[PDB]
Design an enzyme around this catalytic site. Structure first.
Site, PDB file in Angstrom:
ATOM      1  CG  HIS A   1      -2.223  -1.072   1.156  1.00 40.11           C
ATOM      2  ND1 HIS A   1      -2.438  -1.309   0.339  1.00 40.11           N
ATOM      3  CD2 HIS A   1      -1.936  -2.421   2.019  1.00 40.11           C
ATOM      4  CE1 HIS A   1      -3.267  -2.691   0.569  1.00 40.11           C
ATOM      5  NE2 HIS A   1      -3.176  -2.937   1.472  1.00 40.11           N
TER       6      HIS A   1
ATOM      7  CG  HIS B   1      -6.459  -3.284   7.828  1.00 37.16           C
ATOM      8  ND1 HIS B   1      -7.146  -3.319   9.074  1.00 37.16           N
ATOM      9  CD2 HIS B   1      -7.381  -3.085   7.071  1.00 37.16           C
ATOM     10  CE1 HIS B   1      -8.863  -2.840   9.420  1.00 37.16           C
ATOM     11  NE2 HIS B   1      -9.329  -2.792   8.202  1.00 37.16           N
TER      12      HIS B   1
ATOM     13  CE  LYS C   1      -4.837  -7.017  -1.607  1.00 38.19           C
ATOM     14  NZ  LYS C   1      -4.531  -6.023  -1.481  1.00 38.19           N
ATOM     15  CG  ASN C   2     -10.649  -9.494  -7.179  1.00 38.70           C
ATOM     16  OD1 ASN C   2     -10.950  -9.920  -8.608  1.00 38.70           O
ATOM     17  ND2 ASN C   2     -11.688  -8.393  -6.595  1.00 38.70           N
ATOM     18  CD  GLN C   3      -8.842  -4.686  -2.996  1.00 34.83           C
ATOM     19  OE1 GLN C   3      -8.600  -3.439  -2.964  1.00 34.83           O
ATOM     20  NE2 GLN C   3      -8.167  -5.444  -1.754  1.00 34.83           N
ATOM     21  CG  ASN C   4      -2.736  -3.419  -4.005  1.00 41.74           C
ATOM     22  OD1 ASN C   4      -2.355  -3.377  -2.481  1.00 41.74           O
ATOM     23  ND2 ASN C   4      -1.636  -2.701  -4.032  1.00 41.74           N
ATOM     24  CB  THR C   5      -5.598   1.478  -2.318  1.00 40.89           C
ATOM     25  OG1 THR C   5      -7.275   1.655  -3.152  1.00 40.89           O
ATOM     26  CG2 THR C   5      -5.755   3.117  -2.541  1.00 40.89           C
TER      27      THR C   5
END
EC number: 3.1.27.-
Length: 133
Positions: A15, A128, A38-42
């Site tokens: 992140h 997280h 990983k399906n999504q990540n910022t």
């Protein structure tokens, strides 16, 4: 998470990136430690020390974990790059493809006491990324 990392080290890898390349490239650095894409990540375009200091903001409810109240919201919008997996049927990491969505949003992190493997420099660390707003 990969067991070789603490929650905070794995948070920083996923992140924190000040100048990430396009998602399909930036995500390889994360997926290399995983068995599946990983399906999504910022990616927050900031520094670890900056996020640690957000852990000192007033404790609030975590929007994506409503039984928790160890979350902390940034006082300012920060530039970010969000990446969405275009081919979620991928069976391995070799050919994960990602769409790019740049933005500038407030972020909300959960913070907790550090792991003994974490640097003694930060006794409280982000563990997280809860959401962005």
């Amino acid at each position: 998470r990969p067991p070789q990392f603490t929650r905070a080290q794995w948070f920083a890898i996923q992140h924190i990136s000040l100048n990430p390349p396009r998602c399909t490239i930036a995500m390889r650095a994360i997926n290399n430690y995983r068995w599946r894409c990983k399906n999504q990540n910022t990616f927050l375009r900031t520094t670890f020390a900056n996020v640690v200091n957000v852990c000192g903001n007033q404790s609030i409810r975590c929007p994506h974990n409503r039984t928790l109240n160890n979350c902390h919201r940034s006082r300012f919008r920060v530039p970010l790059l969000h990446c969405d997996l275009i081919n979620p049927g991928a069976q391995n990491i070799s050919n994960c493809r990602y769409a790019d969505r740049p933005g500038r949003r407030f972020y909300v992190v959960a913070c907790d006491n550090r792991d003994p493997r974490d640097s003694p420099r930060y006794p409280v660390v982000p563990v997280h990324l809860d959401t962005t707003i």
